[PDB]
């Protein structure tokens, strides 16, 4: 089939992603490039990974990390963005 099955974490990862971004709007309020960037990279990230449980881990992890640790929000921004391309729209490694 695919992996776990016909699973769909699409709905999750979309609003999940914004949980981070809406937070990013607060934190990187003087830098409105971050949020649109994360949006942008997600758009050009392969829709499969974005609809997979793995990305749900990434999101739930990095987003909530950035919530607890605003000081390193960017690292999680960095991760989440790289995460998108690392495992999507370039997925030869995995």
């Amino acid at each position: 089939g695919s992996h776990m099955g016909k699973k769909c974490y699409k709905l999750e990862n979309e609003k999940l992603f914004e949980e981070f971004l809406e937070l990013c709007k607060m934190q990187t309020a003087d830098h409105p490039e971050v949020v649109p960037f994360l949006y942008n990279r997600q758009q050009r990230a392969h829709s499969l990974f974005l609809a997979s449980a793995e990305f749900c881990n990434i999101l739930s992890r990095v987003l909530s990390r950035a919530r607890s640790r605003p000081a390193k929000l960017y690292v999680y921004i960095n991760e989440l963005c790289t995460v998108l391309k690392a495992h999507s729209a370039k997925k030869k490694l995995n």
Partner: peptide, 18 residues
């Protein structure tokens, strides 16, 4: 090798204390 700037891709213009 770096086929993307990855984390530094952000660092280019914005970042925190790090």
């Amino acid at each position: 090798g770096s086929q993307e700037d990855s984390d530094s891709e952000l660092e280019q213009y914005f970042t925190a204390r790090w």
